[PDB]
Structure formats: structure tokens, C-alpha cells
Amino acid sequence: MQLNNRDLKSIIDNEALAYAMYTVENRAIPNMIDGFKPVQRFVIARALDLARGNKDKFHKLASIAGGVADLGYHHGENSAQDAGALMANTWNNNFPLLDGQGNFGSRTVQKAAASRYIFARVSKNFYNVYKDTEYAPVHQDKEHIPPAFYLPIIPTVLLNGVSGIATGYATYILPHSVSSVKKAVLQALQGKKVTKPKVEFPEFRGEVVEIDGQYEIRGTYKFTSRTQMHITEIPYKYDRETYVSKILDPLENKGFITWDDACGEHGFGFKVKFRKEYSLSDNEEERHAKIMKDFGLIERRSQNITVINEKGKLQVYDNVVDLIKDFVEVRKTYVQKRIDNKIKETESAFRLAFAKAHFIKKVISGEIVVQGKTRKELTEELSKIDMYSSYVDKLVGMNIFHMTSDEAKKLAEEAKAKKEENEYWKTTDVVTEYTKDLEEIK
Amino acid sequence: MQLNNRDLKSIIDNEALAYAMYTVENRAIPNMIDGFKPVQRFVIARALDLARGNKDKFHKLASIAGGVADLGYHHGENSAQDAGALMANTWNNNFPLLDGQGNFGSRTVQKAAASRYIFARVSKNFYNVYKDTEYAPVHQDKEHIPPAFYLPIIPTVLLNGVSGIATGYATYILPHSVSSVKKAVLQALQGKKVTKPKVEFPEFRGEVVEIDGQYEIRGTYKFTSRTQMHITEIPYKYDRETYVSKILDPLENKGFITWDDACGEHGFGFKVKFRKEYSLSDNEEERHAKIMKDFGLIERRSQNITVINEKGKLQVYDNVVDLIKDFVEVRKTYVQKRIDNKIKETESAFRLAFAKAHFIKKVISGEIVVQGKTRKELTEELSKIDMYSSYVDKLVGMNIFHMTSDEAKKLAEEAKAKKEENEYWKTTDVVTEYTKDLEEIK
Amino acid sequence: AKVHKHIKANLCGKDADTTLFLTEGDSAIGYLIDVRDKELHGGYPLRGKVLNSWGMSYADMLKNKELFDICAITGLVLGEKAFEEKEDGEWFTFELNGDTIIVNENDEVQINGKWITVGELRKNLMKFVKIDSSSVDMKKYKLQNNVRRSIKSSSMNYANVAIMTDADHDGLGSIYPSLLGFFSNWPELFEQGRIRFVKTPVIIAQVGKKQEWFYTVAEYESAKDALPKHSIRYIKGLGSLEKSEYREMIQNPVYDVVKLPENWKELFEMLMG
Amino acid sequence: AKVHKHIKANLCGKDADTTLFLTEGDSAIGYLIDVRDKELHGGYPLRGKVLNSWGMSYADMLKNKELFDICAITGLVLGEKAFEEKEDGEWFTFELNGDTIIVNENDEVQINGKWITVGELRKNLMKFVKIDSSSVDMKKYKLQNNVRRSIKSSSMNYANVAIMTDADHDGLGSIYPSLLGFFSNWPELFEQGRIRFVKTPVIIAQVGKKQEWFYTVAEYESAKDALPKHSIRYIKGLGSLEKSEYREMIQNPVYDVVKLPENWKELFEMLMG
DNA sequence: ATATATATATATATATATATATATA
DNA sequence: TATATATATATATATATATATATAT
């Protein structure tokens, strides 16, 4: 029986230092590298677990969200359901990481079906841009089966567009076009001046202009008569449920306009006819300004880049350029790590293939006789030769057809191919490889 | 554009017919063969899915219950949680099929811990009896991944002890000893007269007797003075929560007795002090009857064998003897099916091994030279000889060390072993195989 | 007034073959917006469960928001006939596909999935036999499911109503029997085959680049052997339907047109009561 | 009266070191029944989080079932001293483990996990220095955690009270500090360290056939490599323990004997809110 | 043409038996 | 008095690419 004398201050400190670990694995701040909030990281890891065997199979969203609790996600399965539902569509993401089969929503109506009906899988975008996932850092919490963060080759934190409001901190990033982000990353890699990546919202036909840092996200319209106008786009912040109930409802309530729906397969649409009681300014600029202000067609968005570095700390950036630079640096280090491990692995593979080719050549010629040598009497004989130091377990134990004439040459060809691969991996740097992985995004 | 003419009768009847298929997978009536209610079958199938790899790994009960919805279980996860919790203990089961790691309850307190804390896995009992699973019938519903029923060698429906009440039907079976059930099965299999298997409850120290068909389940007790007795067992229907609050508490309220708890590792116990108010009968039999009636030591249980038979219908049996007889008949059918398929499988295996041994013995002497030819050249050449018809992909394609002298005999040894296995599986009947499987239920 | 979640069709309220879709849930209404014919098809989402309404008490069941919105959209009002039929005039008989059918000069005939006026059929070089009204068998006329009286004046905003529910929500409570019980307040809709039900396929089989839809599991089980190599998807709800399949099912719909039996007033009590 | 869920001890209410276990959940109480000894260890299960007990009327706390049963079992009553200490007498000072210790003739000394009377120590041939009461440092006397006064008369049924809760509920809700806030109404329990809290191991490592218990993750990570081939299991709660480990933890317990700081009243209005 | 989307053959890391040493009541 | 692993060892099988090919753009 031990009688320790822990004080109440230690009790309070230790109890508080578990709500400071229960609200940090659920911090709605995207990681700098993979752009994943922890719930999205768990969903992606679960969808990668389910994608083993058939990458193209669509798994139920209920299954994907129910399997996250076994990977170390200590929050509800509804959170994983909603993360997958918002992650598996195309209207909300420039570069969606999950594919979708079912009704995942649209810009018009932004709610997915029940998680039991909609199916999802990791898209070709994920496998295209998320590489070196075997070198991703292991989490400090050993119950966190997914890594500390994944390793995309471009800062996916900008592509899809994040918005996280937490206690004491808030992040807000606008979706950037994939091509501009790729070009900025290439410029940072080579060492050139990085041009500001342009903001491009997914499935948005309007226009975005940068003024004083703030972004004017403006809808577009076209006039068909003196009193008939056609709204052919609205700002990305709207959906038909809230556009009608915030802008068009008061307008038709005051008798200004009469409108009918024109939505469809081509986004939004609202044909509008004005009334006499709604005065139209004769000046073109005044009319355009009052239409833009009256119809909610202009929204201003301010970017607040609050992300979590590779060190696990909270970092705030003024402009996305330095985000690109630091991400390029850390991903450059990880590509170097991949370079080194691949160098050693291809060297070992080349040595093994060379030993295999030599053994096949000698047994075809007849130098090494495998006839009438039992099992633990030829193995130690092979162990004597230097080339077969630790390869005998794999050298005698390979199939018989390797000893024919056709596959004897095929083994030497693979030996030379592995030697060439080793030379390639030991000649290039991070610049060359991080570049080569960059032209395989489109 | 079609226009069918449903008449609100094909609507109402189909709506009621869909509520039928939803209640034939939730009826609390065990299948006569495997003794499984559908929820228990889904739990067992899920725990078998998780037991791939490490069979001894304890999986969380929350994981086991959450994985049943993907196997075709359309009811809640709490149902699977409770089914696993009740299956995985030893107090409630004479022959448990799920193992346990944690607080799964006891007879004293019949409540298991939270499903997130307790772990479970399929026990060695399941693999002992539940065999021929590859020959279990495929369910008519293609979303029912578990089979129609499993195939234990003994009627597990009697061992653990089932109790369910359905819509217009109710089942009630008493837990039978594994040894008596196995002996009855052997008697039925060999054609002898079947003795009624005796009823024993798991972790029960009392006695059970049979009069007028009903079972008198009595708890034992012992006296130590004229007013002091030690209750050393109570009927299986009680727990310390209800035995104290339904017998001992009323007797305390009436002032008859004063008692103290004695429940321990061994089981139940309640030492009782008798007061002057509690009248003591001079006659020993009158005193014993008064004790057995006042203290709730007597429980009478009536057996109502309502079991879903092989055809999928509801069959009510008069006595467990006929259940064992019909079960032995249908399991005889399935053991014969296994015998036939194993005959056809081991014949092909024997001929493949014989072809392998012949090829090795020929290439030892150089009859089939592998050097100087191509893989496509050798495959066609080997396809010419009669014994190498579908084995060429497995004949040239087996490892090199087979062409030694020691491993050239381990192939002939396996050929002889497969010939012996063919003899054993083609000269024996369902009787012998069912007998052999019955002698491994220790 | 204006119903919020309702999606008004362009021709709604006119003399056009409009349709209203009482889709289950608010998620599929977006797919409807994407795929609907803007001129004809309307729409309204049902975000709940059994709507009761068999207990009557018009005021009590007008408390439900969904029922009130449906009444506002469709133009239906409880206790009043949905539409007034044309006055009886001259009766005519013709041999339609070898079947003798007795009609009147102002009914509509369902031919090949389309409803054609009596005058149009007369103008289409079809023989018509004039028969005195007293010599017309009303019992035979009422039994003809391919003949419906032409509407003289209608307060209905939509010419049809198409229910649209999930296959997983059948038997375990639903809105289809509940919507049927609500729509029974105007039997004239069923007499003309107005209230319908879009048959969502239960199994969608992808035979290569083509698709075959099976509306019952038994149909697929019987037809799977003759099918070529294919992969199937269990469509347990409208949410599991892709937008292309949703459009193929909206633009080419198959309707289980509910017909009231001789005892509809009694058949709705055994389920809801 | 009597408490239903309470499990009495044989010597409860007598002069013995009987303990009452406030298990979280009704499941762990069965393991307690199986592994406890009948003489000393009692027991009572707590199902959920006990309601806050800070800044509330005595009637309000007496409404709660769990708090009322705690008061009934422990012999404790709100607003009244838990026990009355012996009258102060002659003061004696000795040197224990090279440290000067000042006690009375009726005090308890905590040596090797056991409380030994002053009279027993005097009978153990240990030198005692008689010191006048006016020349005794009370501040140093009250700062010794291994010295406590012997109780003359006590209304407490159990000598000690042990808390036993799940390890995944320490911040994701709270059951432990709420119990501490309730027990704070009798500070004399803490001044002698009556209120305790057993340490359920966080990681149980099976080194072959033996077992090693790690009470924090950091200790296991530090000792992970020095350990031999072993398997571990995260003990996320009491229900995750087997009966043998429960017995090894009850019969050989380690106690976080909580101590009230100089401003515990102010510190309790931090997590309560 | 332009990927690209499917079908198809290959090494390899599990799941399953495959043999057989290790020990608690 | 048996136990129980238990540790290499096979194995066959379910994978994660590599690549041939019909294909829409």
C-alpha cells in the first residue's frame, strides 16, 4: 500500500491538461502541409484503409465515418460523416480528395443526402498529389494511427478553401486555382520570385478582383430589355436557399421586382423584371452600382492564413507567398528523405538482382549444381560465395522457369535496369524530383 | 413514360409485406442448428472477420458492434453490443462462443461494462464445434453476408440457454451440459436410444430435479445453529440486486431475520440470523419447506422449445430428444456434403502432387531439360504429356530447391500422404467423420 | 402567398401538363432543380415522417406545416372538390384495340401513355357510334380505367402530383401511405389517375456503358443470369442515385398511378388509426 | 436506514481502517464484490457524474440521490464536523529518518504506509523529548503530512473513502473533482488524508507472464525500450481491467491522498464555473 | 490522341494453417 | 499430469503496380 500526497493544485493542473489535449486534436485549424483538419485526416486515412484491394470501389459514408473511431478519432461519427460529405463533392473543392457517388449537394442546395445512401472513395486527385505517405511523420500519440500530417506536393491548404472558427483563433483561406498554386510552387522550388497565386472558386463563373488585399467576389448579370435582367451568376457565398431568403425576398416584398427561377445544370439563374415603383437610374455607372449593392452581387472576403506548421505550432501568415515558401522548404526536406531511402533501397534491390542473374547464369552453365545436394548442404555452399551473403534465402527458392534461356536474359536486364535506377536516384536532387512530380498533377 | 395502375391493395399489402421481412430478422427465436439469433449470428460473423490474422487479438466490443451494419444487420448497434456482451461471458453461458477481456458481469451483478472498455473475440469453443462454415447455406438475401446458419457439431441451442419472446411466439430452452448433449448426439448418430440430456446451469452449485416435466431449480443452504444458517447458493434466476431486494429486504422489513452479505469469488452467500418472531417449526420437513418457500430458494422453470429449423420455419418440439434427432439428421447431411467435396478436392490435390513428384524425378535425371528453351516453349511442351494438363502453370513455376535430393522426396511423401487422405475421405461415412469430430469437444 | 421550399414551375397554374414532386428530404430537391424541366415539373421537399391526417379534424391537421404548404402549392383546399367536371352531353362508343369502350363527347382517353380528347379522336378518322344516354351502361363506363372526364374548371395549380420516396423507408413508417391518406380527401384525383408515384429502381445494373433498372429484387434475381458481365448498385434511396440517373428517371418516369378501390374509406383504418 | 446499492463492510462503523469505494458505474461493483475482503472494504457505485456541490444549499445537494446515499453510508452530514479530535496534551519531539518531528501523546505517525500510535512508538524503545506546549511550533507541526491527530469520537462509518473512476473521463466531463468538491465540506478528512483516490494504471504491460503497471503514458514511453518482449493494453477505464488485475489493484493499492491547499475555496471556483 | 478507363499478368506482404517446445494450475 | 505456446517454416492468396488495349476528346 502506497500513500502518495498529490495536492489539489496538481489535480486541477492535470485535469486541465486533458481538455488542452482533447481540444487540440479537434482544433479547426488546417495543417500547413496536407491542409487537413484532424477529422478530415482521419476520414482520409479510413478511406485509404477501405481502398485496399479496390481503389475504385465506392464505400458507404456511414462505414467510412464509423471506422474513424478505431483510428484514434475521439469525437463523434457525425463529425466524420459531415467531413466526408463536404470533402467528397466538386462544388466545394477545386481539388477534392474524396470521390462521390450519390447526392453530395451542389451550390444550389448545399446539403448531402443521408450518409447511408451516399458512397465515397479517395479520388485520383489524392493519389495524384499526395505522395511519400510512407515517410509521413508518426504521431506522438500512439493511438493516432494516421500520421502527424500527410505529404502533398502542393499546398492543398489553399486549393479547396478552409474556414475554421476556434476559441481564441480563427483561420480563413480562399480557394486558389490549382494551376496558379503549382506555378507558385515551381517558382519557389527553382528560386524565382513567386507570383501571387490567383483565387479561383470551384464551379464559379463570376469574377474575383483584388483590392487593398481584400477580395471583391462579384456576381455577373446581363440585361435583355429596359426592365428585364438576367442574373447569370452570384457570389460563391450564396446558395439558392439563402439568396432567395435574404436578397430576392425583400426585393419582391417591397414591390421592386418580380422574379422567376432559372437555375439548372449551369449553376444559378434568376430572371428579373422591374416595376415602376423601383426607380432605375439613367446613368449607367449609378445603375450598375445600385444593382450590385441591391442584388447582393458583391461580397468582400478577407484572408486570414492561420495554419499549423510541421512543428505543430500555430503560425499566421500575412500573404500566401510565405506559406508557399515555407511549405516548399519542408516538403523539400521530405523529398530529400525519400531520395535517400530510395537510394539505399534501389541499391539493395540492384545487388539482389545482380546476385540472382549471376546464380541463374552459373546454374545454366553448370557451375553451381543443385542436383543431389539436399537442402541444408547447398545453402551453406551458396553462403560461401561473397555475392550470396544474405541472399540465399531468396536466391535458391525462386521458380524453375528462371533457369530457362528466356528468363536468364530477362534477369540480367532487370539487374541493369535496377543499376540505372540507382544511378538516377543518386544523381538527382530534390529540385529535379520535386519538379518531376509537379508535371504529373494535370 | 409508363402508367401502371396500382390499386392501393398492392400498395398496402406490399407495405405490410416489407414490415414482415424486417421482423423475421429481429425475432428472438434461435435457429435450431447454430442456436444463433440473427443478431448473434451477425456478431459472430463480425468477430470472425476481425479474427483474420491474429485470432487471439481482443477487439473492442464497440468495433465488433459497429461492424455488423455492413454485414446486413439493419437494426441498431446497441443490439449487437448487448448480444456480444451477453455472449462473451461465462456465467451466462455453459459453452461461450465469444471470449472476454474486461468486466462482462457475473451472476452477482449481471451488467457488463461500457462496450468501449470491454474487449471480445471468438473463443476456442467456437472453433471447436463450429466447423464446415464454408458449406454453410448462403442466405437468400444477398445483403446478408453471414450464412443462413452456421454448422456446429452439437446443438448449441441447448448449451448456453436461450429465452426469447416474439410476435405471437415465445421460446424457452434450459442450458444443458456439454457432455450430456454430446453423448445424446453420439447416441442419435450411431442409432442408439437417446437419453434425455441433463440440465445444468453454468457456474451453478445447486441442484436441479425434474417432476411433472417442469424443472425444480433449488438453491442449497446449510445450518450452523438454532438461529444461524448460511445460504451457500440461490437459483440461477437471481442476482444480488434482485435476490436482496425481493426476498431478504422484505424479510428484513417484516422483522423475521437479520442478514449480512457473503458474496465472494466462489459465488453467492448470505449468512442469516433468525429472530424470536420468526417461528421455527419442530418438524424438519416442515422447517425445510418453510425455508425453501420464504427465502425464494425454489424456482420452477418450464421449457418451451420453439426453434427455427433448417427450412426456415418455426418448429415447436415436444422434448429435446427430437430436437437432437432432427439436428443430427440435418448435420449428417452437411457432414456428407463436406465428405463429398473433400473427396473431390483431395483427389485433385493428390494428382497435382503426383505430377509434381514425377516432374521433379524426371528433371533430376534430365528427362525434361529446362535450359536452352523459353518459358512459352516449355509450357506447350509440358502440355503435351497427359499428366500435365492444368498443372503446367504450377509445375514449371515451383522453386528451384525442389530439384535437390532431399526435397525431391518430400514431394513423394506428400503424394503418398494425399493418396492416404483420399482413401480416408472416400472409404469413410458421415457416421465416422461425425464421430471423430465429436471427440474434440473436451 | 409564397411557399418557401416550393419550386414553382413556369407553366404552373396554366392549362399545361405540370407535375409536382413531393420528394422525401431536402437533399434530392437540388438534384430535382438540376434535372427538372423548368416549364412543367415543379417540386417540394418532405423532410420528415408519417403525416397522419387520417384522423381528420381539418383544423388539427392543418397545424402541420407540410400539409399546409402542400395545400398552398397544389391549390387543394380541404372539404371542397378539387375540380368541377364537364356537364354530361352526348355519349359515343368506339372499338379501341378490339375493345368496345363507351365514352361521352367530353372525356379524355389514355392511349399509349398520353391523354387525348374525344374531339381529337373524332377528328382522327376514328369511327364513333352515337348512343342514347338512357341506353349507356354507367356501371361499364365507371369501370373503364382508360377514360376520364375532361376538366371544365380546375383550381389545381398542377395537373399531376408525383410522389418520390426512398426504398429504405418502406414498411418501417413512410410518407407514401401518409401522403395517400392525405390525398384521399379528394378522391376525384384518383378517379382521373392524378396522384402518382415515381418508381425508383431498387437495383441499377451497369452493363458496360449501358444501364438496366430493376424495380424489384425478384426481377433482378430472375434476369441476372441472362445479363452479361455487370456490376449492380442497391439503390436504397434517392440519395444513392447519381444526377444522370435522376434525370433519366425524371424525364422518362414510370408511374404507379394509385387507383382507389371500392372500399378506400375502410382500407386506410387498418394501417393508420 | 439502509442503502440498496451500498455494499457494507463487516467492521463498518467499528475501529478499523475500513474503506469505502466510490466506483464509477454499476458494473465495476461486481468486480469489487468478487475481489474485496468482507472485513474492511465497502463499496458504492456512481452512475454518471455527481451533480456539482459548490455554492448550493444543503437541501439542493440533498435532492441528489447519489449525494444523499454518500452521506448515509459514510455517516457524514453536511455542515457538521466529521469527527472530534482528542484534547491536546503533552507534546513530544523525536527524530524520524533524520528529521525532527513534533507530535502529542495522542497522534498518528505515517511510517511505511502504516499509521502508528504515539504510545506504540514509545513502547518501541524510541527516544521522546518532552516539550512545553507554549514552546511548540504549531506552524511546523501542521506542515507534517505524516502526522495526524487520533480521533477520540467519530461518527464516520468508514475510516477512509477511496475514489475509483475511469481514466478517459478526466476532463471530458468530470466525476472525480466533483466528488472532491463535495468532500471539501469536511476539510478534516483531507487534513488527515481520509479522502483518497486509487490510481488505475493507464498502461498494463504483460512482460511474459508477469505484469508491469504504468500510471502515465510518459512513464511507459520512458521505460518502453528497457522492457523485454511485451504486450500492452491501454486501460481506458475500470471496465477494461480483468478480475485478477482488479484484485491486484484493490489488495495492493496506491493512493493519491489529496491535500487541500491554503486557498482551496478559491481554487474550486475554477472548474465548477 | 489521349489520356484514360478498363481488363489483365506480376511480386509481395498477410492469413492460414504448419510443426512442434514449453510449462500453470 | 497434462498444459500451453511457440517459434521458425510452408503456403496460397489477397494486395499494389505495369502494362496491353478499347476507347472520347
Chains D and C touch (3+ CB pairs under 8 A): no
Q: Order the strands of the D91-96 sheet from edge to edge.
A: D99-104, D91-96, D129-131
Residue at C29 is within a domain? yes
Residue at B70 is within a domain? yes
Residues close to nucleic acid strand E (C-beta < 7 A): A 56; B 51-55; C 208; D 208-209
Question: Which of D167, D165, D163, D172 shows the shortest CA–CA distance to D236?
Answer: D167
Residue at A339 is within a domain? no
Say whether both A92 and A148 belong to one domain. yes
A183 phi/psi in degrees, rounded to 5: -65, -40
Residue at B205 is within a domain? no
Nucleotide nearest to A53 (CA to C1'): F15
What lies within 8 Å, CB to CB, of A337 at 6+ separation is: A132, A135
Nucleotides of E under 7 A from a protein CB: 6-7, 14-16, 23-24
User: Which one of D3, D23, D27, D38 would you mutate to disrupt binding with B, by most B Cβ within 10 Å of its Cβ?
Assistant: D27
Distance CA A65, CA A46 (A): 8
Looking at beta carbons, which pairs linking D183-190 to residues 24 or more positions away fall under 8 Å?
Answer: D184/D260, D184/D264, D184/D268, D185/D53, D185/D78, D185/D79, D186/D76, D186/D81, D186/D82, D187/D260, D187/D264, D188/D81, D188/D82, D188/D83, D188/D85, D189/D82, D189/D161, D190/D258, D190/D259, D190/D260
The helix or strand, by DSSP H or E, that contains position B364, with its residue range, turns out to be helix B320-364
| DSSP per residue, A265-304 | TTB--EEEEE-TTS---SSHHHHHHHHHHHTT-EEEE--B
Q: Specify whether the CB–CB gap between C176 and C164 falls below 8 A.
A: no
Among partner residues A101, A102, A108, which is closest to C33 by beta-carbon distance? Answer: A108
Say whether both D214 and D118 belong to one domain. no
Question: Which of B254, B298, B301, B245 shows the shortest CA–CA distance to B274?
Answer: B254
Say whether both A118 and A19 belong to one domain. yes
Question: Which of C117, C169, C109 shows the shortest CA–CA distance to C144?
Answer: C109
Nucleotide nearest to D209 (CA to C1'): E24
Q: Specify whether the CB–CB gap between C136 and C90 falls below 8 A.
A: no
Q: What is the DSSP letter of C186?
A: -
CA atom of B21 to C1′ atom of F4, Å:
47
Q: Is A374 on the interface with B (CB under 8 A)?
A: yes
How would you write C226-269 as a 3-class SS string? CCCCCEEEECCCHHHCCHHHHHHHHHCCEEECCCCCCCHHHHCC
Q: Specify whether the CB–CB gap between A248 and A238 falls below 8 A.
A: no
Say whether both D195 and D205 belong to one domain. no
Distance CA B294, CA B117 (A): 40
Q: Could you tell me where the beta strands, DSSP code E, fall in C97-190?
A: 99-104, 107-111, 114-117, 129-131, 147-149, 151-154, 161-164
Distance CA C76, CA C58 (A): 13
Q: Specify whether the CB–CB gap between B154 and D65 falls below 8 A.
A: no
CA atom of A352 to C1′ atom of E21, Å:
35
Distance CA A374, CA A79 (A): 62
Q: What is the DSSP letter of A55?
A: T
Say whether both B17 and B142 belong to one domain. yes
Which cell numbers in the block locate residue A319?
Answer: 500573404
CATH number at residue A251: 3.30.1360.40
Say whether both C72 and C182 belong to one domain. yes
Q: Order the strands of the B207-211 sheet from edge to edge.
A: B207-211, B214-218, B298-301
Asked if B119's CB is within 8 angstroms of D242's CB, the reply is no
Burial class (CB in 10 A: 0-12, 13-18, 19+), A249: middle
Distance CA B353, CA B375 (A): 21
Distance CA B408, CA B414 (A): 10
Q: What is the DSSP letter of A401?
A: G
Q: Specify whether the CB–CB gap between A188 and A181 falls below 8 A.
A: no
Residue found by looking up cell 355519349 in the block: C91
Q: Could you tell me where the beta strands, DSSP code E, fall in B169-269?
A: 170-172, 207-211, 214-218, 221-223, 228-231, 257-261
Q: What share of chain C is helix, strand, coil (3-state, %, to 5)?
A: 30, 25, 45
Distance CA A223, CA B174 (A): 83
Say whether both B177 and B73 belong to one domain. yes
Nucleotide nearest to C208 (CA to C1'): E6
Say whether both B149 and B22 belong to one domain. yes
Distance in Å, alpha carbon of C257 to nearest chain B alpha carbon: 5
Residue at A187 is within a domain? no
Distance in Å, alpha carbon of A153 to nearest chain D alpha carbon: 33
Say whether both C188 and C69 belong to one domain. yes
Say whether both C78 and C174 belong to one domain. yes
Length of chain D: 273
Say whether both D173 and D54 belong to one domain. yes
Which cell numbers in the block locate residue B358?
Answer: 514425377
- CA distances B362 to A370, B409, D163, Å, are 14, 13, 78
Compute how many other C-beta atoms are within 10 angstroms of the C-beta atom of residue B401.
Answer: 19
Range of the domain at D101: 87-149
Is the C-beta atom of C209 closer than 7 angstroms to strand F? yes
Say whether both D209 and D192 belong to one domain. no
Say whether both B116 and B127 belong to one domain. yes
CATH number at residue A65: 3.90.199.10
Residue found by looking up cell 448460511 in the block: B230
Residues of C in contact with A260 (CB under 8 A): 8, 10
Residue at C50 is within a domain? yes
Residue found by looking up cell 402567398 in the block: C1
Asked if A116's CB is within 8 angstroms of C236's CB, the reply is yes
Angle between helices C243-251 and C28-35 (to 10 degrees): 60
Buried b (16+ CB within 10 A) or exposed e, A15-36: beeeeeeeeebebbbbbbbbbb
Residue found by looking up cell 395545400 in the block: C71
Say whether both A152 and A276 belong to one domain. no
Q: Specify whether the CB–CB gap between A29 and A170 falls below 8 A.
A: no
Say whether both C131 and C259 belong to one domain. no
Using CA coordinates, name the residue in chain D closest to A141.
D217
| DSSP per residue, A341-376 | HHHHHHHHHHHHHHHHHHHHHHHHHTSS--TT--ST
- Gaps after which residues in chain B, C–N over 2.5 Å? none
**Does B236 participate in catalysis according to the annotation?**
no
Say whether both A307 and A274 belong to one domain. no
Say whether both A238 and A135 belong to one domain. no
Say whether both C101 and C218 belong to one domain. no
Residue at B349 is within a domain? yes
β-pair partners for C171: none
Residue at C273 is within a domain? no
Strand F within 7 Å of which CB atoms in C 15-54? Answer: none
Say whether both A35 and A150 belong to one domain. yes
Say whether both D57 and D171 belong to one domain. yes
A227 phi/psi in degrees, rounded to 5: -135, 10
Residue at B330 is within a domain? no
Distance of CA B38 to the CA centre of its chain: 13
CA atom of B118 to C1′ atom of E17, Å:
29
Resolved by: cryo-EM
Q: Specify whether the CB–CB gap between C237 and C167 falls below 8 A.
A: yes
Residue at B251 is within a domain? yes
Residues of A known to be catalytic: 117
Residues of A in contact with C240 (CB under 8 A): 101-103, 113, 117-119
Say whether both C136 and C167 belong to one domain. no
Which cell numbers in the block locate residue A114?
Answer: 443521408
Where is the domain boundary, B239, B269, B301?
A: B301
The three-state secondary structure class of C112 is coil
Where is the domain boundary, A238, A273, A301?
A: A301
Domain count for chain C, please give it. 3
Range of the domain at B229: 215-301
Is the C-beta atom of C210 closer than 7 angstroms to strand F? no
Where is the domain boundary, B268, B301, B334?
A: B301
Distance CA B402, CA A397 (A): 9
Residue at A61 is within a domain? yes
Which cell numbers in the block locate residue D125?
Answer: 524503545
Is the C-beta atom of A343 closer than 7 angstroms to strand F? no
Give alpha helix (H) positions in chain D.
28-35, 58-63, 65-74, 118-123, 138-142, 176-183, 187-191, 217-223, 243-251, 264-268
Nucleotide nearest to B52 (CA to C1'): E15
Say whether both C57 and C174 belong to one domain. yes
- CA distances D180 to D53, D173, D198, Å, are 9, 14, 14
Say whether both B285 and B350 belong to one domain. no
Asked if C234's CB is within 8 angstroms of B15's CB, the reply is no
Q: Specify whether the CB–CB gap between A199 and A174 falls below 8 A.
A: yes
Distance CA C239, CA C244 (A): 13
Among partner residues A101, A260, A265, which is closest to C10 by beta-carbon distance? Answer: A260
Distance in Å, alpha carbon of B6 to nearest chain A alpha carbon: 27
Which cell numbers in the block locate residue C1?
Answer: 402567398
Among partner residues D10, D33, D237, which is closest to B114 by beta-carbon distance? Answer: D237
* Catalytic-role residue among B19, B73, B117, B150: B117
Domain count for chain A, please give it. 3
Say whether both B39 and B178 belong to one domain. yes
